[PDB]
């Protein structure tokens, strides 16, 4: 890059006030119904959230053991923001290498560990379960049929994007971006800390963001500098962070960190979710970095609402019986 990341962490110009600090027991369905989840939320503690996390001294090797030593993972080259691939055993080997000996900066932010031993060790904030489209919209018998622990597309039976394990070494940086499908994000710092640059998804900023992508000079321009309002917020250990749909953010890792989080679509900001999808469309984002079965999920959402309200089903007879069979469990 050409810009100085160091000063971007020192300056006080990113003093916008977007984030809201909340109590877990205040984060319920009624709150989403009142606000539509438009504001970034931070929970300084876990009380009331209903989350479950592994042992506080959980290691990367423990992650390997739970997902498999030969599990292929998507690794990010920090310097180029490109993507490479190695086994969890190789990644663990790199992560366990002393800080001053690492030949390069690598970042793992895309380890989806659903349907592994790690799955039941980590639990989403309870409220997310009530609104997540995957848990409430997608056909249940399809999701329950999932056996593959990797995100291979041919074996994927549903949007497998609910549980991610992020492992970052000190110095890791993720440039500005909007999570796929315009999904909202829950972000829990298990060990370490993160530094976030936040940008509101206004019409002007989304346009600025898109042109910034097509520009190709994303490594020559700090996006937080050419918007009117940006906030740099530091996330500490034990913190839970909820990112609303469409929010442009970059992230820095001031120390070796272990994060558990996930994405989700909900019914309270569909327009913005569709906005972000079209941006992905126009910027030619490869399908591998996008929300799987996006439009299929959208079709299923319409069916659920129509049925839950008018009692008229638009599923096939076979799909209706599949659901009816599960209602009798």
């Amino acid at each position: 890059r050409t810009f100085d990341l160091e000063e971007k962490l020192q300056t006080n110009k990113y003093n916008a006030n977007f984030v809201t600090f909340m109590e877990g027991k205040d984060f319920n369905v009624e709150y989403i119904q009142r606000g539509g989840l438009r504001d970034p939320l931070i929970f300084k503690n876990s009380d009331g959230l209903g989350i479950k996390m592994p042992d506080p001294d959980f290691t990367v090797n423990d992650v390997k053991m739970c997902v498999g030593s030969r599990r292929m993972v998507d690794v990010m080259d920090v310097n180029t923001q490109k993507g490479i691939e190695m086994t969890m055993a190789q990644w663990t080997r790199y992560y366990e290498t002393p800080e001053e000996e690492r030949e390069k900066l690598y970042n793992v932010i895309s380890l989806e560990f659903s349907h592994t031993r790690l799955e039941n060790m980590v639990q989403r904030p309870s409220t997310v379960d009530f609104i997540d489209w995957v848990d409430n919209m997608w056909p249940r018998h399809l999701k329950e049929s999932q056996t593959e622990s990797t995100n291979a597309i041919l074996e994927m039976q549903y949007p497998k994007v609910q549980k991610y394990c992020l492992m970052s070494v000190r110095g890791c940086y993720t440039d500005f971006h909007v999570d796929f499908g315009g999904t909202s994000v829950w972000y829990h710092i298990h060990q370490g800390g993160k530094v976030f640059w936040l940008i509101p998804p206004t019409a002007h900023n989304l346009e600025l963001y898109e042109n910034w992508l097509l520009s190709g000079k994303q490594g020559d321009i700090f996006l937080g500098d050419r918007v009117s309002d940006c906030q740099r917020i530091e996330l500490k250990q034990g913190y839970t962070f909820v990112i609303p749909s469409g929010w442009i953010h970059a992230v820095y890792t001031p120390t070796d960190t272990l994060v558990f989080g996930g994405n989700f679509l909900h019914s309270f900001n569909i327009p913005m979710q569709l906005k972000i999808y079209s941006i992905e469309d126009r910027t030619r984002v490869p399908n591998k970095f996008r929300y799987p079965f996006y439009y299929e999920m959208c079709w299923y959402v319409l069916e659920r609402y129509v049925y839950c309200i008018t009692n008229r089903s638009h599923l096939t007879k076979d799909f209706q019986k599949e659901s009816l069979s599960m209602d009798m469990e």
Binding site: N151, I153, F180
Partner: peptide, 10 residues
């Protein structure tokens, strides 16, 4: 080269 999806990367 098995195809994948839902990968998080900027």
């Amino acid at each position: 080269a098995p195809a994948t999806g839902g990968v998080k990367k900027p």
